[PDB]
Design a protein around this ligand. Structure first.
Ligand SMILES: NC(=O)c1ccc[n+]([C@@H]2O[C@H](COP(=O)([O-])OP(=O)(O)OC[C@H]3O[C@@H](n4cnc5c(N)ncnc54)[C@H](O)[C@@H]3O)[C@@H](O)[C@H]2O)c1
Ligand SMILES: NC(=O)c1ccc[n+]([C@@H]2O[C@H](COP(=O)([O-])OP(=O)(O)OC[C@H]3O[C@@H](n4cnc5c(N)ncnc54)[C@H](O)[C@@H]3O)[C@@H](O)[C@H]2O)c1
Ligand SMILES: NC(=O)c1ccc[n+]([C@@H]2O[C@H](COP(=O)([O-])OP(=O)(O)OC[C@H]3O[C@@H](n4cnc5c(N)ncnc54)[C@H](O)[C@@H]3O)[C@@H](O)[C@H]2O)c1
Ligand SMILES: NC(=O)c1ccc[n+]([C@@H]2O[C@H](COP(=O)([O-])OP(=O)(O)OC[C@H]3O[C@@H](n4cnc5c(N)ncnc54)[C@H](O)[C@@H]3O)[C@@H](O)[C@H]2O)c1
Lengths: 336, 336, 336, 336
């Protein structure tokens, strides 16, 4: 009858997914987090260092979180298999813990009663979707567990689609200058799997690997072999920027690039890709719901066939809105 | 024969304790950390965001850390009881994990072969020592497990001793404006035991409780009932400041306060308490080995009996040196 | 007929005063800033690193700034005497440049045609007002040029008034942990008048003098001789906190302190002083319009007569609102 | 007889140039800064937020700065033409104010008695030099006034020279993720010439233009038309990184790129270009004297002909050393 949602992991993305759901009239029926009891959830949801106080009412009673009079069951389970999704009637589950990334790890939600799962991160094997790029690849009958890619991939893929369809990308290399996140440390500490990520996040420009540019070639297969990249983590709490250096097949004077991006923004990618010529900086995108905001004046061309294109994203807020848009899209299609 | 040391928990304090030991010719024979293998220890020890590259040679071989040609056994045990302290011959153990604070929790080191333990933090029950204040209270025959207090207590106690002995402290209230630490978060996340400490460390002035001012009254009993305080955590990676507002028994014109602090610095507290009149700010104390640096010009008096006194400390580096000074003192006394 | 306002110096305060004036329906008829032409004023007004995009329309035409269809004359004069206030019909002028602080310096606005001047900072000699504390001391016939004090004074004075009137303040010493401002530097540079204020704002805890605590004894003369204080500047862009350590005449158990503050907040100081028991940190007060937000749980008492009281303020936003409230009050009273 | 130096503008570069000169035994005979009297110069020189306390003695007497017993005349002139260079016997002048960039502007030093001028920034017209790249283009008889380029150019040019000479650069596009500097603001303020640079430095990723990548094609003319780039300013106080995305003529497997860079570092560019494979972040280069430190593991290749190369630089310290190396080179050659 209606889209109902459950959120596993009430972190940055989990909480801002809940905000996005409220803004978009999507029913959340449960939140599970083992480290956050209902009264503490109220606090964490209401006050936000980056995105301000929640505009609305937040309370708890009866082991529930109450947002603007909508009651939300709260569970405290450490593993997906333990979560009582059947109790709240087979909701679509957002898997936002960061620790259950494979189809196998995620499927424990399905066996615990979830109708679908959207992993809020890239998956080694779940099929991957970027709204505005390949969401039509979703198959209601055969895809119980999907991935909504990364924030970075949601920024690059829409831009890469427009540039590729208009000019042809021969080859590209991406850098994202990216805000620090929850996986990083306040001071130099242990990160055995990626030593540089242990270094103090507030003190350092930190190079990091990312699969996000390659991930674009999974959602736009015709770019296979033509894109990769890396990241720098820097001392800002939110908002990131993509810097795509690409070699183009057809002549691409910069005025022609701008006309293509503007047309995409105003039409087939309205709400996903935005276009600006203002003299913006990162804080200007706090709370912006777009996946990718093309910065006309920040980019530079060496010539008509070799350009550096710049596009912003609120990696927390934009991505969280895409999770909700993907959920809603899945549901309309699952009515087939 | 000689002081030998083992370090449990190769974090900020563990690593800077090792630096301090090298600077002071103290033999470290083992480091245990379950999350840091020998080759990774080399990296973590050599490069430091706050205190620069280690000036010397750092390498590994044979499952050992080699600092300036001194070989250090590396263990990888998750619990004190598992650590083979007997293997390296009953060393004095620095317990710097932050998780083994009681006499009971710490004593597992003794049963695993440690001669003594210095907990690098306040303890609910271990006796507590501040070099320059009460280290003579140490009893070789009856104190296997001690605490070296907190960084803040090592800053306040020496100042409080001088002011109290010269003027009489009727009552005092302390604020420490304190750098963020490893227990804090890069972005708003879970801190169930102290909700405010979960809020993004780089973004916020964060009020926090601290027992450090009261802890001064344990190491200077005559101040019992006369001191307490609180903290603000702020967006700096190291160096903190004590702001002691006190009501004094005898007239204390500020010139008289300065003469007392200077005399203590030049004599009975040389190396522990320092005195400055320069126009300093926090970065000026990076790497400073003193427990407490009195800032003459930052303080203000309402009158001769009510004053606000300001004193700095490198909470990482100064404290780490005091751990080493306490170890060395214990050892000279344990020869009795 | 109506309150009309001119702003001299379209900086942090100047711009946020315009925001406050729009929010409160107060007519701004001109802005003067020699370093900001109208088109640039649109940009600076529209986008704000700390307080988000202006919610409304911002444009320029005909050498005017147009905010939500209200047209604002823009002047570009380097000195008050040069500004054509007569042209926009004798407005009340906000003097927010930071450089015209005395009666003598500010009186050039009056001779250039301003009806009144409110200096957005303490003055060596203009009379000083804190809304909710002493605004009734304003005399329409004899005070052309007034001061609205500092952000810090506006935070401390209302709290001090409540505490003094209920319990009696014997003596007090204040610290404010304060966000950096426009007078500070990005990296170590020249500050000949106050050397510490030249040191990098983002890197340091910086001790600073402030007359703000003494200024409270100007606006509450019964506190003369009983209050002073100092400041620490820290690496946050906005929001500050007052820490008042005070000896009280009547017993003041903390529960009684809280009832006094809550009753003031609900009644005679509604909108000026607020009361909270939530686990707040500084970002929680971004955009808060109160002069003072008492933090119940952050404060600490040594005993019933010696307490540390903690109160927050958005130094930029709250203060800017008080400028507008003072303008509006001056005008209703100037109708006499 | 000997190289003697005068510094105009005792800022970040000016002060660190004096540090470099002490480290390298180069005689500084005068410093001019109108905003810094001798006693204040002691303070600014002695204490440094980013590079620690000066290791040595710093004092003033007789209107002189005394660093390690070397006496330095201090002048206080607002314009080059006013400075008494003749009084200290025709020194080589470092022009580090940021405001006298042209041949015409800088030539007032020559007529005020300077033997040579090195402008510590790019010039619209002075010839430009990068040590290790084109210093041999200097002509003692015809070049009174030269430029030492920018920090960024000094990082990119040596790397570009190596890569171009080994593999051929077809085309390249550079991004530098760059620490904030003295021209930026603590909070959103006026930057009429470049609006984005006015936005709060500590809060934002800020896109900026830079001529630095083009400037490399001035110092390596064979790259004309083949290189340009842009910048992001980010919230770190010092140390920056170059990200060069380039198409190469000959196949360049990454292993071959690394051997070329290592062989340059060990040989013809010893001291200018360094090579690392450690897991470094920006603070790891504080105080590093190299112009360029190639980060082997941070770079990424799409294929053998399309690569992203990553190289670090302490924009303050490394560049300052190059000023001193250029002075010393100019002098040995001026003996002709
Ligand atoms: N923050 C961003 O910019 C962003 C953007 C896109 C994708 N992502 C991805 O979203 C996922 C979550 O990221 P985040 O930034 O919200 O991290 P976070 O640390 O803020 O979120 C983790 C939350 O999940 C909880 N949790 C941990 N283990 C759990 C378990 N076993 N069961 C239930 N809950 C558990 C934690 O309490 C925490 O509240 C990660 O894969 C991350 O890569 C993050
Ligand atoms: N950093 C300071 O300013 C400071 C000052 C005084 C006291 N302290 C105290 O020192 C203690 C350590 O603080 P820190 O700042 O070094 O924290 P940290 O996070 O830097 O140190 C923790 C280290 O111990 C390791 N560890 C965790 N659990 C372990 C276990 N079970 N067995 C062995 N090792 C384990 C972690 O890998 C980490 O390397 C804490 O009690 C802290 O309160 C810190
Ligand atoms: N920011 C705060 O937290 C705060 C709070 C309370 C009071 N104040 C006071 O408000 C005053 C302004 O503060 P701010 O933070 O907005 O500073 P700011 O530097 O942000 O604003 C100053 C503005 O004045 C302009 N200006 C400079 N000289 C001028 C002149 N001669 N004529 C006209 N305009 C000129 C500049 O262009 C700039 O836009 C200062 O006295 C400050 O002490 C600031
Ligand atoms: N900081 C870096 O990373 C860096 C690197 C390479 C080049 N540069 C260039 O070096 C030059 C100086 O840079 P900075 O970062 O040291 O700036 P800064 O602002 O730190 O130093 C400028 C100094 O010049 C002084 N000054 C101003 N006007 C003067 C005048 N008329 N006469 C004499 N002194 C005057 C100021 O008092 C200040 O001490 C600029 O051109 C800058 O582009 C900077």
């Amino acid at each position: 009858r209606e889209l109902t949602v459950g959120i596993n992991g009430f972190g940055r993305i989990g909480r801002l997914v809940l905000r996005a759901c409220m803004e978009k009239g999507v029913k959340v029926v449960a939140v599970n987090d083992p480290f956050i009891d209902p009264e503490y959830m109220v606090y964490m949801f209401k006050y936000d260092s980056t995105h301000g106080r929640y505009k609305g009412s937040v309370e708890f009673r009866n082991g529930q979180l109450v947002v603007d009079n909508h009651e939300i069951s709260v569970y405290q389970c450490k593993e997906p298999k333990q979560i009582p999704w059947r109790a709240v009637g087979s909701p679509y589950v957002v898997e936002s813990t960061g620790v259950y990334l494979s189809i196998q790890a995620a499927s424990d939600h399905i066996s615990a009663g979830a109708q679908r799962v959207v992993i809020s991160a890239p998956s080694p094997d779940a099929p991957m979707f970027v709204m505005g790029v390949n969401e039509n690849d979703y198959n209601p009958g055969s895809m119980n567990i999907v991935s909504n890619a990364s924030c970075t991939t949601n920024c690059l893929a829409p831009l890469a689609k427009v540039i590729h369809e208009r000019f042809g990308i021969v080859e590209g290399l991406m850098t994202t200058v990216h805000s620090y996140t929850a996986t990083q440390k306040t001071v130099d500490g242990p990160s055995r799997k990626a030593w540089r990520d242990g270094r103090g996040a507030h003190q350092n420009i930190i190079p990091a690997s990312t699969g996000a540019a390659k991930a674009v070639t999974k959602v736009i297969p015709e770019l296979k072999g033509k894109l990769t990249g890396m990241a720098f983590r820097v001392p800002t709490p939110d908002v990131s920027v993509v810097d795509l250096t690409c070699r183009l097949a057809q002549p691409a004077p910069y005025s022609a690039i701008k006309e293509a991006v503007k047309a995409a923004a105003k039409g087939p990618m309205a709400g996903i890709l935005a276009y600006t010529e203002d003299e913006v900086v990162s804080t200007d995108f706090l709370g912006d719901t777009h996946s990718s905001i093309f910065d006309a004046k920040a980019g530079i061309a060496l010539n008509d066939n070799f350009v550096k294109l710049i596009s912003w994203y609120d990696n927390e807020y934009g991505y969280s809105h895409r999770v909700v848009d993907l959920l809603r899209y899945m549901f309309s299609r699952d009515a087939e």
